[PDB]
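Lab notebook, bench 4. We co-purified these components, and the gel suggests they stay together. Before we commit to crystallization screens, I want a quick structural picture of the whole thing.
Request: model the full complex, all chains together.
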Amino acid sequence: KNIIIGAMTALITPFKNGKVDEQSYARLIKRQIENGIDAVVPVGTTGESATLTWEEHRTCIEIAVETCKGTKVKVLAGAGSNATHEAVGLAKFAKEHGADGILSVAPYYNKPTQQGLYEHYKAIAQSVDIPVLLYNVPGRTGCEISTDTIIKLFRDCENIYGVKEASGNIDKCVDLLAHEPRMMLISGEDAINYPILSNGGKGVISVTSNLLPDMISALTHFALDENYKEAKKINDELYNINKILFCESNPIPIKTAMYLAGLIESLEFRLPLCSPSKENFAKIEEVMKKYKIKGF
Amino acid sequence: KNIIIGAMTALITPFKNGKVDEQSYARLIKRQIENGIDAVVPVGTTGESATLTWEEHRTCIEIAVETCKGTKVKVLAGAGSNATHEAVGLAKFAKEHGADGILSVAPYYNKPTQQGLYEHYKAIAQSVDIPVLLYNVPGRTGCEISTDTIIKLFRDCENIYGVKEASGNIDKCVDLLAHEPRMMLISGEDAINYPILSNGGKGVISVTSNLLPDMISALTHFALDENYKEAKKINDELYNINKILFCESNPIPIKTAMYLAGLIESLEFRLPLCSPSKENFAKIEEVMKKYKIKGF
Ligand SMILES: NCCCC[C@@](N)(CC[C@](N)(CCCCN)C(=O)O)C(=O)O
Ligand SMILES: [Mg+2]
Ligand SMILES: [Mg+2]
Ligand SMILES: [Mg+2]
Ligand SMILES: [Mg+2]
Ligand SMILES: [Mg+2]
Ligand SMILES: [Mg+2]
Ligand SMILES: [Mg+2]
Ligand SMILES: [Mg+2]
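Here is the predicted assembly.
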């Protein structure tokens, strides 16, 4: 299988005066490239996929592809939807506009059955010839892609190559790689990046790496190189910021931190997201001061 | 406050050859009207809102409005979204095309904070002059509108008049009506329709009423008259069908039941929804044989 692995960043989407700040978006991606990241994920949850227009969603994928051209950093485009026809449309757009692969979240809100998830992802995978990474995040979607469904999809669909797990369930991570060791398990939960990698996971799709790309990429590369002592050391050092970045729903804390570090111009969200409480604003700033934050 | 209460139905959306079967939709609404239902909810979760196009979503609202003219029956249009700008657009469409009010589900997938939920619903409520019913269903959305947030919205926004609860939490139902007894608490969970009404809830938005509208209407109206013995008896009789209609994710069982009773022509869903397992198909039919199902 063709794969996209390693240290990857779920890119925030900066807004300025209610619009995507496209120059800032490109500048943030260049900063990721300069700090050892292996791939970027435009317009995931962290990128406020729910509130972008179709035009903005397309535009962010295009900026990621164009900014990474000639750098060997890959683009794993956010392409999921809770409507299969929408997810297929996004997959085809990503393929036709030069993405290296797609990330495709389990359908949210309408709670498909395992049979429905299988048919959903089969339709998506049959619509493109680029790698497809499943994405399980039951706390946000209301459904779980079971281990059996993930493994069947990996075995039945040639371009489905693994899953990004954001489920707080290291037992399931063992289950997955004990029964199907050929798949690429990707951490979608920063606090437990190292335990997932040490069990044979092959990368991360990170929130924290927006702010600390050098640290997350180093953690991942230490682990893939089997230097588990140094990967664990970074995972331990990052625990405090990894947790504070979820004191309110992602990406409210990470965008706040990026604004506090001077990396984006305006602390703007699209409703229903909004700025954090004054108390959490202060907690985020306090935890950030313990870390060296790379500039541009 | 202007209110929409009583026995209400979350309408299924029938498809035939991949398109909304508009004549069937109108016929199903007339069947609800003739069996004592007080309001219909086009294009909620049960109506597969996630997978309808915008044009189909608009069309279903219009068919409901047109079909209810000249009757007591109100149209509480499904108008929620996880993007505030989409929810405002739907609210304004429903208002301008003659809906009596709107149902507005809490944003799914992006997990807004309570502050964000307040700002979301404030924007929706300020955009129209028709009643707005909140809708809390954390198992599908990944977030909870807290009692405090619901109560603030009811007190601060003229048109927000209550909430449809689908949370399996009678303690919260007590909390709501003990601290704000003027709100309209609406059951969004058929199995516990009677306990919610007997605590002072004033209606239901029902899945089961698609199949058994006369029974749900009788239950509700007995309860509203404090004829609790009769209301409880119907609630108890309905428990088995109320549970089997969730043996797979709603609306897979209810659409299957409507097909099994000859009330729709084709058992078609939009992916990622799909037909139930053959075993659940048989279980649904067996439970259906225990109930008296009105025709057209
Ligand atoms: N990334 C750009 C598009 C975002 C669209 C949407 N807000 C809503 C998606 C939708 N399937 C639209 C249904 C429209 C008709 N009811 C949903 O709300 O479920 C989402 O997927 O989060
Ligand atoms: Mg590299
Ligand atoms: Mg097993
Ligand atoms: Mg979060
Ligand atoms: Mg401080
Ligand atoms: Mg038409
Ligand atoms: Mg009328
Ligand atoms: Mg309280
Ligand atoms: Mg009476």
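The pocket of magnesium ion (ligand 6) is lined by residues B 59 (CB under 6 Å). Worth comparing against the SEC data before the next meeting. The beta strands of chain B are 6-10, 15-16, 19-20, 39-41, 74-78, 101-105, 132-136, 160-165, 184-187, 203-206.
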